Amino acid sequence: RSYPCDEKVIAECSNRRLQEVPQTVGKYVTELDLSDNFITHITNESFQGLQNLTKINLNHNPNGLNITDGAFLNLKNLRELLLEDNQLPQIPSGLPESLTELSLIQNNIYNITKEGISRLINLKNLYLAWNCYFNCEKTNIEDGVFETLTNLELLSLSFNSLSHVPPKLPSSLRKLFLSNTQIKYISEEDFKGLINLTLLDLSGNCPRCFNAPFPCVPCDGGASINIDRFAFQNLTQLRYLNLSSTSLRKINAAWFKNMPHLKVLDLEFNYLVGEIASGAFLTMLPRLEILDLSFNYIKGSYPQHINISRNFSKLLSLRALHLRGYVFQELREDDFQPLMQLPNLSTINLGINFIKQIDFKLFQNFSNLEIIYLSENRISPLVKFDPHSNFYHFTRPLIKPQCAAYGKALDLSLNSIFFIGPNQFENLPDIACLNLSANSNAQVLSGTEFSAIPHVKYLDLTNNRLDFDNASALTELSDLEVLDLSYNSHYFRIAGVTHHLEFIQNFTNLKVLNLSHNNIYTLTDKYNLESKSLVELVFSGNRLDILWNDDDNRYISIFKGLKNLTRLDLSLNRLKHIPNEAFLNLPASLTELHINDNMLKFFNWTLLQQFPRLELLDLRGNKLLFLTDSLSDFTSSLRTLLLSHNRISHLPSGFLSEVSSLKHLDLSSNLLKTINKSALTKLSMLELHGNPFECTCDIGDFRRWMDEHLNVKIPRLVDVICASPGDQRGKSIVSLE
Amino acid sequence: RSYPCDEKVIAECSNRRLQEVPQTVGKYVTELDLSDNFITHITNESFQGLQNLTKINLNHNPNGLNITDGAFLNLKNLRELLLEDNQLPQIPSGLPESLTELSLIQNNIYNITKEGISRLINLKNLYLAWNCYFNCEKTNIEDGVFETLTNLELLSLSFNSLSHVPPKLPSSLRKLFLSNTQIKYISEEDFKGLINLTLLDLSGNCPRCFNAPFPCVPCDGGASINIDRFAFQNLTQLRYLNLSSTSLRKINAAWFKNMPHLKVLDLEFNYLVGEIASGAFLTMLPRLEILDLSFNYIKGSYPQHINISRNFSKLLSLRALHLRGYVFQELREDDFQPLMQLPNLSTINLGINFIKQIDFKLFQNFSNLEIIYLSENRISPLVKFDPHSNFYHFTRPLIKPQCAAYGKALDLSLNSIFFIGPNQFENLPDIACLNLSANSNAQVLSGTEFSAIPHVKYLDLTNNRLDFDNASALTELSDLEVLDLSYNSHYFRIAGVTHHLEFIQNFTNLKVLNLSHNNIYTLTDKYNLESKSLVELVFSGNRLDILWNDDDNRYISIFKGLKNLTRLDLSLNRLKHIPNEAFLNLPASLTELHINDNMLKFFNWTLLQQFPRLELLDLRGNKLLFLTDSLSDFTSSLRTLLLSHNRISHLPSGFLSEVSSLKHLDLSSNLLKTINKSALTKLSMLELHGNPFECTCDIGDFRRWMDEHLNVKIPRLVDVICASPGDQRGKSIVSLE
Numbered sequence A, B: 001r002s003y004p005c006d007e008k009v010i011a012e013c014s015n016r017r018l019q020e021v022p023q024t025v026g027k028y029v030t031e032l033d034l035s036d037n038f039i040t041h042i043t044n045e046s047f048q049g050l051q052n053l054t055k056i057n058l059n060h061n062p063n064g065l066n067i068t069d070g071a072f073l074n075l076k077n078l079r080e081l082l083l084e085d086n087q088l089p090q091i092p093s094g095l096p097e098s099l100t101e102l103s104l105i106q107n108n109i110y111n112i113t114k115e116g117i118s119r120l121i122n123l124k125n126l127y128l129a130w131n132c133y134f135n136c137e138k139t140n141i142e143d144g145v146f147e148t149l150t151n152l153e154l155l156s157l158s159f160n161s162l163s164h165v166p167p168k169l170p171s172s173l174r175k176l177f178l179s180n181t182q183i184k185y186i187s188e189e190d191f192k193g194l195i196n197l198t199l200l201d202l203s204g205n206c207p208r209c210f211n212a213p214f215p216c217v218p219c220d221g222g223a224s225i226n227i228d229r230f231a232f233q234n235l236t237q238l239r240y241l242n243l244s245s246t247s248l249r250k251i252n253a254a255w256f257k258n259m260p261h262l263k264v265l266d267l268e269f270n271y272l273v274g275e276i277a278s279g280a281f282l283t284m285l286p287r288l289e290i291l292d293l294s295f296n297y298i299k300g301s302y303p304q305h306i307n308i309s310r311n312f313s314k315l316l317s318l319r320a321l322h323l324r325g326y327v328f329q330e331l332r333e334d335d336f337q338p339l340m341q342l343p344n345l346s347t348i349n350l351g352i353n354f355i356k357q358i359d360f361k362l363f364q365n366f367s368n369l370e371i372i373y374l375s376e377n378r379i380s381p382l383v384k385f386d387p388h389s390n391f392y393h394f395t396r397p398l399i400k401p402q403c404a405a406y407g408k409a410l411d412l413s414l415n416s417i418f419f420i421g422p423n424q425f426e427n428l429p430d431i432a433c434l435n436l437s438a439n440s441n442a443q444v445l446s447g448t449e450f451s452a453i454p455h456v457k458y459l460d461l462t463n464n465r466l467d468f469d470n471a472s473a474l475t476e477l478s479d480l481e482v483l484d485l486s487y488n489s490h491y492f493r494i495a496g497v498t499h500h501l502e503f504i505q506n507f508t509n510l511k512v513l514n515l516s517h518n519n520i521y522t523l524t525d526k527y528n529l530e531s532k533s534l535v536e537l538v539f540s541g542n543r544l545d546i547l548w549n550d551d552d553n554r555y556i557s558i559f560k561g562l563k564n565l566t567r568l569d570l571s572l573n574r575l576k577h578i579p580n581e582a583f584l585n586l587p588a589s590l591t592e593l594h595i596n597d598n599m600l601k602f603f604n605w606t607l608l609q610q611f612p613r614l615e616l617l618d619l620r621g622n623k624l625l626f627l628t629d630s631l632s633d634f635t636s637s638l639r640t641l642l643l644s645h646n647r648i649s650h651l652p653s654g655f656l657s658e659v660s661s662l663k664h665l666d667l668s669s670n671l672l673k674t675i676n677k678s679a680l681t682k683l684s685m686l687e688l689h690g691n692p693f694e695c696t697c698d699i700g701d702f703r704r705w706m707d708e709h710l711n712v713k714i715p716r717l718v719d720v721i722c723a724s725p726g727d728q729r730g731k732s733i734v735s736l737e
């Protein structure tokens, strides 16, 4: 059995509290990840007899790291070497020339000398970020240090006190990163011989200090980055340009004269309100797809409308427009006239703009609109950290891909819609995906509210105060497949009416329903509970304990009518015990059942006979004390059984040698002391970490079983620690002799 | 020493896990509180030799309670008897006739018979609430059961299935409570002989269901409470009338014809929008002081303005007007014209109305306005449970009394003020108290924002995103005494500027400052830190650990400048150790010092010599392991010393016999095993509960000290449990022989 690393050939050996490099690693290993360990020393004997290695990860070691000269030199096949967050005072000496990837981020490297990297001619990707950052005083770049690296495609020098663009850069460069490098002025000679440059990042130089995870210092006298007219004169191949947080007031149109392939342009966190109103540079970008002009607002300025230049109609290739934090009161049809002529424009981002009123008729004017993002605005009822991240642009999808896949998406979440008005969805396009999350919506749903958009397939109504007790609630949305009513708190509770879940029956296509954290302790559905389409139900964070503890036993067949249900989540329901009759009434069509994070003192395993389709049973975070011995007689379909964070002290005799269908069995964080031969198949995984094991002679039977059943993978063996005796405490069960 | 009760003559014996009534109670005791105990049986021998008792509290027993016939009959001086939440099936038989107060709330009493209460002629206050509630089917009231009780002033029958008003009620009645009693119709004969009635509560009968902590069922066909024109024709002495949640659409003015003393009128949770627009009943209330018409809104109706009847000018005695949940878009000067002529109107409650715009010039039109409550509205930047509770009306003060005491109060909390506009406080009265809490205000304070109201003495700016790095921040408010910047998260952090607390110096009257949970780990104030007015600083939930762990020791005199400081809160600062030099730099003028809920491993008691005014030292929730023996040489002013929730295993020899000024010493929830004679004055209190005491022969020395020092009060002796041996485990240290 592979110890302490997990073989897959890639060997995962990260976060295992290793004080030194393990010599128990196989010679056949090509990739070794030793990150997040307490390793302090690296020598030539650390990777002895490992010529087959290509990738070595030694990040965040310890919790600095001492590396001898030519410690990696013996490895002729080493191509990737990650040495991030190691507190290295300089570049490691005698590095192998075979390297193509090198990452030296978050170290104390203040000098980029020829003695360290000039020998490495095979380097393709080089990362030297967060080295001389707020310590430093200036990063010493040796004259023509990168000139010898003629095969360098990517060079990241971001987050370093540079002041000036490094001279004598290789012509092979395709991606250049110089973010937060204190470079105030850019000249024509800075990017002269870079004919193959596709990416240029100059963000955070003379910045507009906002919500940043890193220290921000703006330039003296509110100064902007000074870029010469002829600075980007020979960057014909540039596709990506990042000029975020550069305190720009004006954009010279001449910068894009010899730039006809520009695909992405980042201009967020600048002072360009005037440039948005009249932009000459907009006629210079016919191949631009993504444009970000976010958080460009004037401090204390709340205008009536957004001033969009007519030159926005010249952006023929535009697919995405990000106009967050412009801050304006009203959006009219006339204001967005230049964008209406754009054929590829599918995404509009108007989040965090505090817009009070929008003339929603303007969105059906667009040719190919797919995403309308209006989150964190003020629309009211209408009546009659990691360094390898994009810090200034949001990479996360604006709408959940599950929602957006159905069709036209509209996000009206975190607004002032405290009730759905009769003209709320007036003159709106054919929306298939709608988000009305955290609007504090206290609407009594009757089946008249969503009449204007009756083709919604995915509806997010989370964190509201909605009333869906009426049988005709949401019935106007016949094509509805997904309904998310998570964290909904009833504001007009009626005894003998709340909760009335009769509305779900009327839907012919509703497959996914989530009424989690709704605080359902009362049901009034006289007849239970039919839905021939529903496959997934999330009933987590409710009060099933109250419902099933009922003296009259009224809610005994609460989910019996859902004869198509495959997944059921009953977690966080404060369940101490499930009545035998109530469990038998659960749909026999279930494949996945979650009863985790409850207070279950006991569980009737015999009742599993009425569930012949059950493959997954989640019983984690409960108060279960014992297990069954005759599990084979109750189940023959169960594949995954999660019993972690329980009070199981003994494994019954003939448990593993009963269930033939079982593959994954989690018994971690329990009260197991020993595993016997009698208790000891198609099992592929067995979790046992965080158990108080007695490392004596009684554990010997289970150790022999581990060597006899090598295929049964036991994860994180280092966390399978002995509780007693004192001399064996701390050590792993596999480390015994 | 009094055990298990604490003598004060009133004997507190509540929540002490008592399975039976203690016989160790003194005969001199007049008041005994045995509530929240596990007592199951009550007999005539339970209170034997206690003739001096007047008040007995047996509430929430157990966690029902079995009482024998005439168990209390032997007590001739018993006047008050509380028997709440005891699961009593009927009224206790053979109760003493001497009783004046009786509470039988939250029991299973379904019958009010003559055999139980008719003998009790001395009864003044009777409470029979939550007895026949949602079980029941109807509460059986015997004909003329209350008729014999000719001395009854208060009768509460609230939360019981009554259906009809009980006939033959005593003429002595001053307060009648009939809330949520299923009484749909009120006739002239219901309150005929009640000439001395001052209070009538009929709330929750035919209700408008809302966020109620109790079950709510509205009347059939949206029915309102039917009150006869002459139903209140003889209630001339009525001062308080509660008609909340009665689904009223119209108020008959005839109900107040013979009611000239009505002081308070509750009409919340009804459908009286039309009545507010035109109310004939308003001319019938000249002596009315408090009027509540909250949550009267029309469902789905968001009107442009509030329609206030001109008859509101006839409410000459009005002091408070509560108009929450009316729901309207804009408030104009003309809309509040009838209220402007009212001389006593001091409080206006317009909370939860979603008002987008208010013409703030209308508030200076009022004669004696003191409280302007506009919380939970939509004002944006202006540019160029217990049964004895009032369930329908808010009893809590609208503005904190400490704020309101300074003068005219304005509450604009939980609104849309994301920045302070130039016309935000345009045409506003002389405000001395302002609340701008939870507005998500990201304003860069410069000293121009609060220009229109420069007489603010108390300013609440909690839960915002404010920037106060500018030295001229809030300096326009020269008379400012209290500034609350709690939970403020800086949205625009600048390295070398954030945090800059230079603004505090300019204030000549700032006494109290609260910058708690501001996450202050960086300071840039080149010179520390003068303020000759500040007496209290709350620096809790910050990062003093980072500030004092500084390699250059820049923030060593962080609070030295505040030469008037008496109270300093340094809790939740993640402090593991305080540097000796940094502690000496704290103000000598201090009287109260809180360093609680930190991670302090050690504390230098010697440094207390530079603090001759220190009376209170809070060191709770820390990791302190040992104490000093020569405390007398370091302090002679210390009165209170809180050391609870620490790791103190030993009390040094000559600790109590050193500090003569010490009165209160808390050593609870520690690791103390025994207290010696050598370690064993003006001490009045000594806390030691939750300590692992070794109840052997070594504890005997401390037990003798307890009997010798009876004046040194040890609270909750039942919680001072032995850890070892097994036979003594669970028992109290005072229970040993």
Ligand SMILES: *[C@@H]1O[C@H](CO)[C@@H](O[C@@H]2O[C@H](CO)[C@@H](O[C@@H]3O[C@H](CO[C@H]4O[C@H](CO)[C@@H](O)[C@H](O)[C@@H]4O)[C@@H](O)[C@H](O[C@H]4O[C@H](CO)[C@@H](O)[C@H](O)[C@@H]4O)[C@@H]3O)[C@H](O)[C@H]2NC(C)=O)[C@H](O)[C@H]1NC(C)=O
Residues within 6 Å of the ligand: A175, A179, A199, A201, A203, A240, A241, A242, A264, A266, A387, A388, A389, A390, A391, A392, A393
């Ligand atoms: C200024 O603006 C520029 C341009 O917008 C930004 O540049 C981007 O920066 C991000 C973050 O550093 C880059 O993202 C990284 O891309 C790597 C390559 O992935 C591409 O190629 C593979 C195939 O080889 C595709 O599968 C994939 O879809 C991509 O097309 C990834 O390897 C990186 O992944 C990392 O994160 C993930 C998720 O956490 C981990 O699982 C990985 O292990 C890994 O650590 C990452 O996604 C992006 O490529 C850059 N743009 C371009 C065009 O190259 C600047 O960041 C921005 N500056 C600032 C300061 O904001």
Ligand SMILES: *[C@@H]1O[C@H](CO)[C@@H](O[C@@H]2O[C@H](CO)[C@@H](O[C@@H]3O[C@H](CO[C@H]4O[C@H](CO)[C@@H](O)[C@H](O)[C@@H]4O)[C@@H](O)[C@H](O[C@H]4O[C@H](CO)[C@@H](O)[C@H](O)[C@@H]4O)[C@@H]3O)[C@H](O)[C@H]2NC(C)=O)[C@H](O)[C@H]1NC(C)=O
Residues within 6 Å of the ligand: A402, A403, A462, A482, A484, A486, A512, A513, A514, A516, A536, A538
């Ligand atoms: C209310 O309840 C609903 C229903 O449960 C919730 O919606 C589901 O949320 C889960 C996440 O919690 C979604 O599942 C995730 O989908 C990701 C994307 O799936 C597509 O892409 C992958 C490839 O990347 C394909 O294999 C797949 O077939 C899909 O086409 C997956 O990447 C996620 O997988 C990862 O996490 C899971 C654990 O969650 C691991 O088991 C995986 O190994 C993997 O690491 C994941 O499956 C799900 O799609 C959502 N469903 C719907 C209909 O939206 C709501 O979120 C919930 N609401 C609230 C507020 O709680």
Ligand SMILES: *[C@@H]1O[C@H](CO)[C@@H](O[C@@H]2O[C@H](CO)[C@@H](O[C@@H]3O[C@H](CO[C@H]4O[C@H](CO)[C@@H](O)[C@H](O)[C@@H]4O)[C@@H](O)[C@H](O[C@H]4O[C@H](CO)[C@@H](O)[C@H](O)[C@@H]4O)[C@@H]3O)[C@H](O)[C@H]2NC(C)=O)[C@H](O)[C@H]1NC(C)=O
Residues within 6 Å of the ligand: B402, B403, B462, B482, B484, B486, B512, B513, B514, B516, B536, B538
């Ligand atoms: C930011 O920081 C400030 C300053 O610390 C906080 O404001 C103070 O908050 C405390 C409570 O946390 C307030 O103290 C309370 O005052 C009440 C009223 O006292 C006045 O009236 C009595 C007579 O009724 C006078 O004797 C007294 O001198 C005052 O004039 C008291 O009733 C309270 O007592 C309760 O607590 C004590 C223990 O502290 C118990 O012994 C009592 O039995 C009782 O239960 C209490 O003393 C204080 O007045 C506030 N000051 C100001 C200026 O507002 C802010 O709350 C804080 N902000 C946030 C968001 O945390």
Ligand SMILES: *[C@@H]1O[C@H](CO)[C@@H](O[C@@H]2O[C@H](CO)[C@@H](O[C@@H]3O[C@H](CO)[C@@H](O)[C@H](O[C@H]4O[C@H](CO)[C@@H](O)[C@H](O)[C@@H]4O)[C@@H]3O)[C@H](O)[C@H]2NC(C)=O)[C@H](O)[C@H]1NC(C)=O
Residues within 6 Å of the ligand: A375, A395, A396, A398, A399, A400, A403, A413, A414, A435, A436, A437, A438, A460
């Ligand atoms: C409807 O609108 C609401 C509100 O706008 C929206 O809720 C938001 O959902 C997102 C996505 O689920 C939440 O963001 C997440 O935040 C957690 C931390 O709290 C992160 O872990 C998430 O992922 C990050 O980390 C991953 C790596 O582990 C990355 O791969 C990934 O790119 C992320 O960086 C994620 O960011 C967000 O917190 C909520 N907001 C609120 C207010 O609830 C909801 O999802 C919308 N629904 C639909 C159908 O669009």
Ligand SMILES: *[C@@H]1O[C@H](CO)[C@@H](O[C@@H]2O[C@H](CO)[C@@H](O[C@@H]3O[C@H](CO)[C@@H](O)[C@H](O)[C@@H]3O)[C@H](O)[C@H]2NC(C)=O)[C@H](O)[C@H]1NC(C)=O
Residues within 6 Å of the ligand: B175, B179, B199, B201, B203, B240, B241, B242, B264, B266, B387, B388, B389, B390, B391, B392, B393
């Ligand atoms: C309907 O309105 C009336 C009048 O406003 C409400 O009466 C008030 O009820 C509360 C709680 O029962 C009383 O307060 C209690 O007073 C005692 C004695 O002072 C005190 O010991 C308690 O701690 C508590 O403060 C209050 O006195 C009483 N008002 C009057 C003038 O008697 C009634 O509660 C309302 N009904 C509902 C269901 O909301």
Ligand SMILES: *[C@@H]1O[C@H](CO)[C@@H](O[C@@H]2O[C@H](CO)[C@@H](O[C@@H]3O[C@H](CO)[C@@H](O)[C@H](O)[C@@H]3O)[C@H](O)[C@H]2NC(C)=O)[C@H](O)[C@H]1NC(C)=O
Residues within 6 Å of the ligand: B375, B398, B399, B400, B403, B413, B414, B435, B436, B437, B438, B460
């Ligand atoms: C300024 O406005 C805010 C927001 O309304 C005020 O905060 C509110 O403070 C009160 C207590 O003073 C909290 O209400 C209740 O407190 C009782 C305990 O006294 C508790 O039992 C209730 O459950 C409830 O919490 C209220 O939650 C709190 N609101 C927020 C958002 O924090 C603030 O006190 C006002 N300041 C001044 C100076 O008036």
Ligand SMILES: Cc1cc(-c2[nH]c3ccc(C4CCNCC4)cc3c2C(C)C)cc(C)n1
Residues within 6 Å of the ligand: A295, A297, A298, A299, A300, A301, A302, A325, A326, A327, A352, A353, A376, B418, B419, B440, B441, B442, B443, B444, B465
């Ligand atoms: C001086 C000034 C401040 C702001 C201002 N105040 C805010 C309050 C909250 C938030 C977000 C809202 C959603 N959740 C996270 C925080 C954003 C802002 C902004 C802008 C858009 C950055 C706007 C203007 C015009 N002037």
Ligand SMILES: Cc1cc(-c2[nH]c3ccc(C4CCNCC4)cc3c2C(C)C)cc(C)n1
Residues within 6 Å of the ligand: A418, A419, A440, A441, A442, A443, A444, A465, B297, B298, B299, B300, B301, B302, B325, B326, B327, B352, B376
């Ligand atoms: C159908 C309908 C619903 C509402 C409606 N929506 C709300 C959302 C939140 C809150 C509060 C706000 C502060 N925090 C606690 C909850 C109150 C309301 C109300 C009223 C006043 C009850 C209003 C009208 C006219 N029609």
Ligand SMILES: *[C@@H]1O[C@H](CO)[C@@H](O)[C@H](O)[C@H]1NC(C)=O
Residues within 6 Å of the ligand: A041, A066, A067, A068
């Ligand atoms: C690094 O290791 C070498 C091993 O020869 C040792 O001589 C040197 O002192 C070590 N340096 C540090 C900083 O640990």
Ligand SMILES: *[C@@H]1O[C@H](CO)[C@@H](O)[C@H](O)[C@H]1NC(C)=O
Residues within 6 Å of the ligand: A233, A234
């Ligand atoms: C770009 O470089 C080429 C090669 O030296 C040259 O012909 C061309 O004139 C340069 N562009 C500009 C605008 O100077």
Ligand SMILES: *[C@@H]1O[C@H](CO)[C@@H](O)[C@H](O)[C@H]1NC(C)=O
Residues within 6 Å of the ligand: A316, A317, A343, A344
């Ligand atoms: C984007 O627009 C161009 C015309 O400007 C068009 O040729 C191209 O096909 C569009 N892209 C897509 C993905 O359709």
Ligand SMILES: *[C@@H]1O[C@H](CO)[C@@H](O)[C@H](O)[C@H]1NC(C)=O
Residues within 6 Å of the ligand: A337, A338, A340, A341, A365
């Ligand atoms: C927007 O739509 C309206 C109505 O169809 C039309 O009159 C107007 O010309 C459109 N404008 C643009 C630029 O799409």
Ligand SMILES: *[C@@H]1O[C@H](CO)[C@@H](O)[C@H](O)[C@H]1NC(C)=O
Residues within 6 Å of the ligand: A445, A446, A447, A448, A470, A471, A472
């Ligand atoms: C349920 O919705 C329908 C449709 O609007 C409405 O007629 C009916 O009155 C609603 N039910 C209740 C109880 O209000």
Ligand SMILES: *[C@@H]1O[C@H](CO)[C@@H](O)[C@H](O)[C@H]1NC(C)=O
Residues within 6 Å of the ligand: A532, A533, A534, A535, A563, A564, A565, A566, A589
């Ligand atoms: C769920 O219902 C659909 C029809 O709406 C059906 O195709 C599917 O097979 C059903 N699932 C099960 C497991 O019966």
Ligand SMILES: *[C@@H]1O[C@H](CO)[C@@H](O)[C@H](O)[C@H]1NC(C)=O
Residues within 6 Å of the ligand: A580, A581, A603, A604, A605, A606, A607
């Ligand atoms: C399981 O439930 C059945 C009834 O459905 C009952 O006969 C059996 O005794 C139960 N077993 C346990 C362990 O409670």
Ligand SMILES: *[C@@H]1O[C@H](CO)[C@@H](O)[C@H](O)[C@H]1NC(C)=O
Residues within 6 Å of the ligand: B041, B066, B067, B068
């Ligand atoms: C109450 O106590 C008496 C004591 O004489 C006993 O006879 C009776 O059975 C008890 N009843 C209950 C319900 O505990």
